[PDB]
Paper text:
We also constructed an inactive mutant, KlCESH[L]-D48N, to obtain the enzyme-substrate structure because D48 was proposed to be the first step catalytic residue. The first step was proposed to be a nucleophilic attack on the carbon atom in the oxirane ring by residue D18 in RhCESH[L] and residue D48 in KlCESH[L], forming an enzyme-substrate intermediate and opening the ring with an unidentified proton donor.
All these three CESH[L]s exhibit high sequence identity (>60%) with L-2-haloacid dehalogenases, which are members of the haloacid dehalogenase (HAD)-like superfamily. Studies have shown that both RhCESH[L] and KlCESH[L] adopt a two-step catalytic reaction mechanism by 18O-labeling studies.
Numbering used by the authors:
A (entry chain A), B (entry chain B): 40 to 275
The structure:
């Protein structure tokens, strides 16, 4: 009746989406004969995705997978760059696939392996199952299971998403820990009886953007990396 | 558009529940001072389990976790054994827990690792997520995802379960292969457009029981082990 299972937020917490979109974006445009400010594209793409996802959650748009939202969001932001109209549909599919390739932080894979030697480990992502399984496979990120909010057609912080984790692994809330670099996610899990571990990710939005990494009173654990979290849990 | 993902039946195809039941049951019964015919127990237990899954599909029984199905099936078969009435509910709980501890065939883990190096791999099981995750973890069975019929509150051969596989991994039916040692499973998947691979398991019910390992014309592959299947798919 101690901690039995750890559940992980994927974007930010485990993978560096900023460096993926900006560096692969630059390689993508170079091969095609143009250049662009990919930091701006990345920010615009993320913001447009979140606005469309919000419309799904509010019922103003029909339900669809996060991969499709990313792909429709891409069409939207490309209309504000003069080179955007030069990308055909296959070009935009390839760019959209980067969200299924988000690279790990350099602590993520070894920390995850150590944690798995002691606990059941699983994602609990807001994204599509297809994208998350590929992120984990491409990153060689070990998990006992892949779960995402898509399996209950919802989004965090809907309690159904957290309960999906408990039901799927067969444990009670106090035996589960939510691990994230986003406080809204940990707040919701804590209110449902999960233990919570915060991983500080000071470069989540790139090298130059200040991120809120300060500790909070309700965190069970405060860590600077997945490797550090494994140490404090005695998973050596 | 080429094979992208393999989906595995787990009990029987990948893990040897007969050896697990006979070995655990033998120890279970020795400490209680009686002997049982564990070959017959295994046959009856799986048959009652399958009959109850069918009731879930037919709606004669509301969906419950497969571990509750195994537990109630055990109550049913224990009326056919004189020692069965000597087992209280806690005894029966202990015996039921073996369904999350099934031992892999010797070829399963190396074959699964080779296939994962070439394809996306996933379970697609009727067992609970909790049990199948734990079977895979205890047996060091590598997968890119753990899917079970629990995620759509049904059971194979319900078409919803095969669609769950395609939606979750994000591929089309012809890009997916169902792998099983049971023909009902491959027949249903083939009818939905999957490729299918049969793995012969002549000792699924021990050395004294005959099982159907004959090939069929609709099998895309017929193999005697997961390693042999990996050889056939160019994964070695
Ligand atoms: Ca896995």
């Amino acid at each position: 009746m101690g901690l039995k299972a750890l559940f992980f937020n994927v974007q930010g917490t485990l993978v560096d989406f900023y460096s993926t979109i900006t560096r692969e974006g630059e390689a993508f445009s170079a091969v095609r004969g143009f250049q662009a400010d990919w930091t701006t594209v990345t920010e615009q793409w993320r913001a447009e995705y979140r606005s469309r996802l919000d419309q799904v959650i509010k019922g103003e748009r029909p339900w669809t997978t996060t991969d499709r939202i990313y792909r429709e969001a891409l069409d939207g932001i490309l209309a504000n760059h003069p080179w955007g109209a030069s990308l055909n549909s296959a070009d935009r599919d390839e760019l959209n696939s980067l969200w299924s390739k988000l690279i790990p932080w350099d602590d993520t894979a070894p920390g995850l392996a150590r944690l798995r030697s002691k606990y059941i480990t699983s994602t609990l992502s807001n994204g599509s199952m297809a994208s998350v399984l590929r992120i984990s496979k491409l990153g060689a990120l070990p998990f006992d299971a892949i779960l995402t909010a898509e399996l209950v057609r919802s989004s965090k912080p809907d309690p159904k998403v957290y309960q999906l984790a408990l039901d799927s692994v067969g444990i009670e809330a106090h035996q589960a820990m939510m691990v994230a670099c986003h406080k809204y996610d940990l707040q919701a899990a804590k209110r449902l009886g999960f233990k919570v571990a915060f991983i500080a990710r000071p470069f989540e939005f790139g090298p130059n953007k200040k991120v809120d990494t300060k500790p909070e009173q309700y965190f069970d654990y405060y860590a600077n990396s997945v490797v550090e979290l494994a140490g404090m849990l005695g998973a050596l």
